[PDB]
Amino acid sequence: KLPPGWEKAMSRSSGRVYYFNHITNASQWERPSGEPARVRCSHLLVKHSQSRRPSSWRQEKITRTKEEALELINGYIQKIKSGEEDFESLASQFSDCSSAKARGDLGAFSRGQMQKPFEDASFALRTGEMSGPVFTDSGIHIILRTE
């Protein structure tokens, strides 16, 4: 009926239906449109105190909580979806991954090289699509599939 991992849902404030993808954690109002060896993604990582390495080029000692980290991710997603800010601009300034220097880009990759929730989401995104918050041992990700 619907593409991989999508379900119908109802907005709690509106009452109108919307669509949600439990693999990528994306949500939209529109019924989603319509697998390759490799995909190409960029991402924005917000680490927290339980990240595998609680440190980054932005902070020698990352001390925020997972909940605080999720709030930061949600903020960026709002600004990206509203158009006030571009994904590349926010990655470049705020991602705790060193890939921030490259506007968040990671290159292309196959299944089995990335952490699994990141890989599942990356491969479930269509080209040009953004994910919701995705959780890994590194922290909370916003993923943009570019190829």
Ligand X SMILES: OCc1ccc2nsnc2c1
Catalytic residue of the set 41, 43, 95, 99: 43
Number of H helices, E strands in the chain: 3, 7
Q: Which residues contact 92 (CB under 8 A, 6 or more apart)?
A: 100, 101, 103, 104
Q: For ligand X, give the closer residue by CB, 26 or 134.
A: 134
Q: Cα-flanking dihedrals φ and ψ of residue 101, to 5°? A: -55, -35
Binding mask 100-139 for ligand X (x = CB under 6 A): -xx---xx--------------------------------
Instruction: Report yes or no: 5 and 27 within 8 Å, Cβ to Cβ.
Output: no
Query: Under rule CB under 6 A, which residues in 40-79 are in contact with ligand X?
Result: none
Catalytic positions are 43, 97, 115, 138, 141
Write out the residues near ligand X by the rule CB under 6 A. 97-99, 101-102, 106-107
